[PDB]
Design a binder for this molecule. Structure first.
Ligand SMILES: CC(C)(COP(=O)(O)OP(=O)(O)OC[C@H]1O[C@@H](n2cnc3c(N)ncnc32)[C@H](O)[C@@H]1OP(=O)(O)O)[C@@H](O)C(=O)NCCC(=O)NCCS
Ligand SMILES: CC(C)(COP(=O)(O)OP(=O)(O)OC[C@H]1O[C@@H](n2cnc3c(N)ncnc32)[C@H](O)[C@@H]1OP(=O)(O)O)[C@@H](O)C(=O)NCCC(=O)NCCS
Lengths: 427, 427
């Protein structure tokens, strides 16, 4: 039925990286128990709340399909409770810090000794053995360390962070691959393992394409598909011309194609008003003829100066400039449709508002409405992977310690035993 | 031990999304066989080559740990081999445009019949059932459809694509999650499933925080941590203030924090000539004091209009402007160290040049030196996940059809018959 039914997960994570990971596992049928700080809880609960004292959307959108229990781990009894839980867990996940978990006394060594089958998964800022093996890291810093910032934005501008969670959720998804990889291994050894993912590494993996460019640039001195390859097109804030004669590290290429064919972000009707009135237009080599037909430029079909990638290198930006001219009186969708008739890869820039109420995404289960009778329903992103014989069942995020009792019981303890922990405040 | 040792992968993928997925599976021990078009193969082979007649870096960096076989699938004998091969595979991965595999006659249905244990995994532009179900999609088109573009960049600029491969490799890694999940299911039902990942959904999943903001905006009409929230700081076309008045869709916030505490991208010594001479300075709350200690500024710690998130969302950009002045005569690293003391979340913008040759990343195996005796060594990104009892062994990319015979024999074909497939031009 569900990929991870019967997999018990001890979630010590907070914020985004770890939470995203365990939430996805939970979507695949895993039993996720989130161990939070007594009284405070995951710091995302009171982060940018849309309504006072109600768990914020930051928390609910990253902690669905999870149960919560409040436990003070800097406590002797708190550390014992873990042992009862670690012995029942299939996998433990945590962020905290380089050695936050270690200082609590639960080291990889002690854990294996407690449960030879358990898997320990962690998200770090930098890989163990890295000069910055100690630093605390947040989203944007990871983007900077991984090469995404340096290669995102414009040549006449500063390194730009991406709206997408390249360092956080991306790290989470990568950690998921590690955990599942561990699970597949265990089937062959009946022995658990420790898996770790550094945010810098998760970012570098998505920036693979740029490491390709750095080498091409070192070997040839030029990146022909970049705007800077066009003579006198790009300039710095002081008007100095930018060419590859002086570029030694992969530059920002604005809205150039990256790993796709050459492309550019083109304005559409109303761009002055609607910040998202644009389409991404691609000029694939195998499709020049079609482009020429669409823009009424038959003379360009046979012109050696226009019919090959190499020939377009010195005028590509002028061509996009002209193409853009044909979209002046059309909206994103009209342009997207018009291009579709020609089979040209063209897509509109979708605004969050549009994405949130899009029929398609809700129909396929990517944008899901979570039934939350306590905080009120809210939208969330479902499972990006669709299966032929499995449908995720997404349920609301837990209230702080909502299942502390429910859990302590499942362990075996009883009413009286529990009550003591509540008093001593170990729970 | 190798997580996927013994897993046979029938790889029909090309370009980036699918290849990234199979290459990583191979990095984890999987036996990957790449089926390519005859004479030409994966279009990445001759895509921006650095040396004529030599597989490009685009191809080698996404196809290590794989064997290559050529096959004309629009051939009767070609289709017999695939069927024969699907019988020996655990999972088949594909990323040809919508319905391409079906037209070849290999739909999910027929595939299940040929082998009940085989998992069919694929990447597409949009989810099955989506209004844009049948559109061909490249990297940035998916970044636009998934909402990353609309939320990346600046308010006074256009939608901006990320240098990171939000659409391709990101979908590839998500497809890997789906495949491992399907393998965990088969370990129980004893049968394979069909798994798919839409690039739009892969992107949406990393843009989760923006779906958070869109709801926050609808419910409250404002985003306090966004640049537009500050009293006339950002301006539109005409010289006039911006605010969440008339802003109904999550806007672009330049270099704001996003999934973490506030912050900005600050210039450092030489930023005029060094495009990557910047650091990212995060102003968290639980250390506002320390910040005041470095920025030698104690008048804030005791100024309510300064020591709180709410008591600062009106002059955020003013502090940043300030702090940047203190970085004026220092380099990324100097600024990072001078800050690291106060355990502050400050990080340098790493350039591709620095990352490609960072000794640290190569020690931990994140950036790996691939021994390629045929083409010459090249760098690549290794496995982002580190395992306590497993180290990947990265092998060079295959030449077109380099392993055709070797594989046609693993099936059972004889020395002569193979010579016929070559003659008939199916191989
Ligand atoms: C959030 C972060 C970036 C900085 O965090 P922070 O505010 O310093 O909080 P920490 O997690 O480091 O915890 C501080 C201390 O409280 C402790 N603590 C956490 N939960 C606790 C609990 N329930 N009971 C008792 N102590 C607890 C930690 O173990 C740590 O102890 P230590 O000082 O002995 O190391 C940090 O978690 C980190 O560097 N995490 C990895 C980052 C990551 O994954 N970032 C992507 C975020 S989505
Ligand atoms: C590259 C892409 C974007 C546009 O591709 P394209 O140049 O049109 O090529 P296609 O993959 O669609 O293939 C064209 C045809 O050749 C066929 N073909 C592919 N390999 C073949 C082979 N070895 N032998 C015979 N025919 C073959 C395809 O099956 C298809 O047939 P059809 O016209 O009957 O549908 C397309 O693959 C696509 O939309 N892919 C999903 C996109 C994706 O994952 N993008 C992220 C990129 S990393």
């Amino acid at each position: 039925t569900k990929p991870l039914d019967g997999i018990n997960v001890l979630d010590f994570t907070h914020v985004q990286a770890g939470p995203a990971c365990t939430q996805m596992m939970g979507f695949l049928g895993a039993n996720v128990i989130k161990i939070e700080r007594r009284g405070s809880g995951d710091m995302t609960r009171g982060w940018l709340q849309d309504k006072p004292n109600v768990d914020s959307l930051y928390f609910t959108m990253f902690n669905c399909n999870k149960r919560s229990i409040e436990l003070d781990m800097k406590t002797p009894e708190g550390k014992e409770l873990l042992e009862q839980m670690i012995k029942k867990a299939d996998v433990m996940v945590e962020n905290f810090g380089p050695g936050a978990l270690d200082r609590m006394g639960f080291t990889w060594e002690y854990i294996q000794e407690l449960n030879p089958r358990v898997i320990l998964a962690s998200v770090k800022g930098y890989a163990e053995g890295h000069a910055n093996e100690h630093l605390k890291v947040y989203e944007n810093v990871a983007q900077c360390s991984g090469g995404a910032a340096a290669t995102t934005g414009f040549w006449d501008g500063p390194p730009t962070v991406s709206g997408a969670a390249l360092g956080d959720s991306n790290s989470g998804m990568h950690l998921m691959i590690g955990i599942l990889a561990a699970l597949e291994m265990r089937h062959k050894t009946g022995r658990g393992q420790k898996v770790a993912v550094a945010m810098q590494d998760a970012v570098l993996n998505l920036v693979r394409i740029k490491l390709r460019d750095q080498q091409r640039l070192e070997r040839t001195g030029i990146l022909a598909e970049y705007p800077q390859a066009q003579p006198n097109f790009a300039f710095d804030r002081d008007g100095n011309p930018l060419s590859f004669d002086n570029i030694t590290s992969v530059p920002r290429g604005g809205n150039a194609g990256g790993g796709g064919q050459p492309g550019w972000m083109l304005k559409c009707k109303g761009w002055e008003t609607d910040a998202d009135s644009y389409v991404y237009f691609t000029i694939a080599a195998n499709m020049w003829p079609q482009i020429c037909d669409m823009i009424d430029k038959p003379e360009w079909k046979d012109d050696p100066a226009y019919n090959t990638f190499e020939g377009r290198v010195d005028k590509l930006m002028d061509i996009f400039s002209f193409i853009e001219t044909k979209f002046a009186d059309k909206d994103k969708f009209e342009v997207t449709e018009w291009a579709a008739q020609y089979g040209i890869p063209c897509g509109p820039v979708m605004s969050m508002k549009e994405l949130a109420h899009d029929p398609s995404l809700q129909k396929v289960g990517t944008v899901v409405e979570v039934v939350d009778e306590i905080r009120g329903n809210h939208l969330t992103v479902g499972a990006p992977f669709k299966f032929s014989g499995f449908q995720p069942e997404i349920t609301r995020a837990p209230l702080l310690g909502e299942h502390t009792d429910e859990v302590l019981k499942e362990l075996g303890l009883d009413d009286a035993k529990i009550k003591e922990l509540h008093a001593k405040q170990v729970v």
